[PDB]
Structure 1
Amino acid sequence: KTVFHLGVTEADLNGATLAIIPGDPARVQKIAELMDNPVFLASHREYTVYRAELDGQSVVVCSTGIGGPSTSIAVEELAQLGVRTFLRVGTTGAIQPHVNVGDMIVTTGSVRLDGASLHFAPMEFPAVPDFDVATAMKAAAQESGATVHMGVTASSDTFYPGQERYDTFTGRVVRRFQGSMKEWQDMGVLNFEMESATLLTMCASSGLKAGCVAGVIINRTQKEIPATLKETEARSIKVVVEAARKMLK
């Protein structure tokens, strides 16, 4: 009736079966403001929840927090309340030189460098989006006029060593991750983020539709920031909202 972490009920969702799930609680409201009749529902820990409407239909907006453990909680509890479709929006670091700060990336498969995904399916199972959601997300991202890239995302449990950052307190990166970036680069992996491997594996093995779209906020091959930036977020959230439109009507 009423879930452990989210602090909402089935009634609060008003028949919603699609969710937009940004990482940052501070983005939930932003996204809801782009839809119709946004209403605040609840906020507990990293879970801020809104209801809104698109084309006359209920949509839920719920933040995940950073990483797959907290993402998994959110997805499962919305699912218990009737949600069947999940559209993730986020920020990403690009690892290809042809990929630009400001570009959108739609994830066609994730490399599983996370742990939560294994709580749903064995390593050999693909971290793959629902086909309709990936489709809708590509359309939406191209409709924004930005450059869009479809493809493989490296989904890490850490922001630092698992993305091979060396500018850290120790300067160390464990063997498994030493040289990992060049390896992903040669395989044609586009980008780094931290939630998609869990999300996609969990959804694809559990009877749920999911996808991931992210705006590129940094490129790891050049490193340099241009600042501005907020527009990338602005574009990201317009695109995810658009994608939800296409899933609905």
Structure 2
Amino acid sequence: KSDVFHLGLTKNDLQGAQLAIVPGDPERVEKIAALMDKPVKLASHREFTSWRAELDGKAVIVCSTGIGGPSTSIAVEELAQLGIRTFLRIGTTGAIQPHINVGDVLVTTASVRLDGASLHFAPMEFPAVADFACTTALVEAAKSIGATTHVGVTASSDTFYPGQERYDTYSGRVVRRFKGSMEEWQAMGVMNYEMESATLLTMCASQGLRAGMVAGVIVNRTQQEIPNKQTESHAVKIVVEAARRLL
């Protein structure tokens, strides 16, 4: 009933699909697929909910990764085994630049590797870089609908809290490595924080797979640590139109 260990999918389920949009939240999978033709549920196991749809007569996959590089690495590997060669990540993010605002769209060229899983594919010297065609499709999709878009570097962390230098926590402390880190990333022109791109981008770029990253800003970190739908469907429109250009 399955060709892979976790996803609960066969090659036949994909119907020859070579592109997957990979959100974090299993609940957003249906919402992304509903914007394409002939959307249908495939499987749901753990944090891995998968749907198949169609764009311009070509099969497309939407599959959730869950939170973090570890679960992402499972999803991407098992989709690759099934035939997916192009991965488009759609996520939510916290901006660290003063002039990147809530509701803005961010396209990641490459990520700061503040994760562990990327090291299981390539040494730290290797860049967590997005594919050129994917990044191009994402930027061009963003411009076609008139989104406020920033293109550049993202910091990709294995934690929501200390690795993103949040202090409103149980301990209230941040380990030496990350103490004063956000200001440093800010000075280096890093746009934002998320949790999956370093793993996704490194594992694709070091294994002959294409990957792209687009995200909607839901909090600005120069203002607050914790965020307070419209930003969602903005970036979701982008990832689907970008997918159309990559089939």
Calculate the TM-score normalised by the size of structure 2: 0.98
CA contact (8 A) 2:86 2:209 kept: yes
In 2, Cα distance between equivalents of 1:199 and 1:39: 25
What is the rounded CA distance, in whole Å, between the counterparts of 1:56 and 1:30 in structure 2? 20
Partner of 2:89: 88
State whether residues 23 and 64 of structure 2, in contact with CA within 8 Å, keep that contact through their aligned partners in structure 1. Answer: yes
My pick for the range that moved more, 114-123 or 215-224, is: 215-224
Aligned twin of 1:217: 218
AA matched with 2:182: M
CA shift at 1:2, angstroms? 1.1
Shift in Å, 1:96: 0.3
1:194 maps to 2:195: yes
Give the aligned residue type for 1:75.
Answer: V
1:247 corresponds in structure 2 to 246
Determine the C-alpha separation between the residues in 1 that align with 2:144 and 2:72.
28
Could you tell me which runs of 5 or more consecutive residues in structure 2 were left unpaired when the two chains were aligned.
Answer: none
CA deviation string 1:125-169 (max 9, x = no partner): 000000000000001112221210000000000000000000001
* CA distance in structure 2 between the partners assigned to 1:238 and 1:156 by the alignment: 26
Give the residue type in structure 2 aligned to 1:155.
S
Distance 1:83 1:174 in 2: 38
Q: Which amino acid aligns with 1:42?
A: A
Which residues in structure 2 correspond to 1:227-246 (within 5 Å)?
230-246=229-245
- How far apart in 2 are the matches of 1:64 and 1:191? 20
Task: Work out the CA distance in 2 between the residues paired with 1:100 and 1:232.
Answer: 11
Give the counterpart letter for 1:245 in structure 2: R
Deviations 1:4-59 (A, max 9, x none): 10001000000000000000000000000000001101100000011100010000
Question: Percent of aligned positions with the same letter in both sequences?
Answer: 76
Which residue of structure 1 lines up, in the alignment, with residue 174 of structure 2?
A: 173
User: Using the alignment, how far apart are the partners of 2:200 and 2:225 within structure 1?
Assistant: 30
Write the distance in 1 (CA, Å) between the matches of 2:212 and 2:239. 10
- Cα distance in structure 2, aligned partners of 1:58 and 1:2: 18
Deviations 1:67-100 (A, max 9, x none): 0000000000010011100000000100000101
TM (norm. structure 1) is 0.97
The equivalent of 2:155 in structure 1 is 154
| Aligned mates of 1:224, 1:76 — CA distance in 2 | 33
Q: CA deviation at 1:224?
A: 8.6
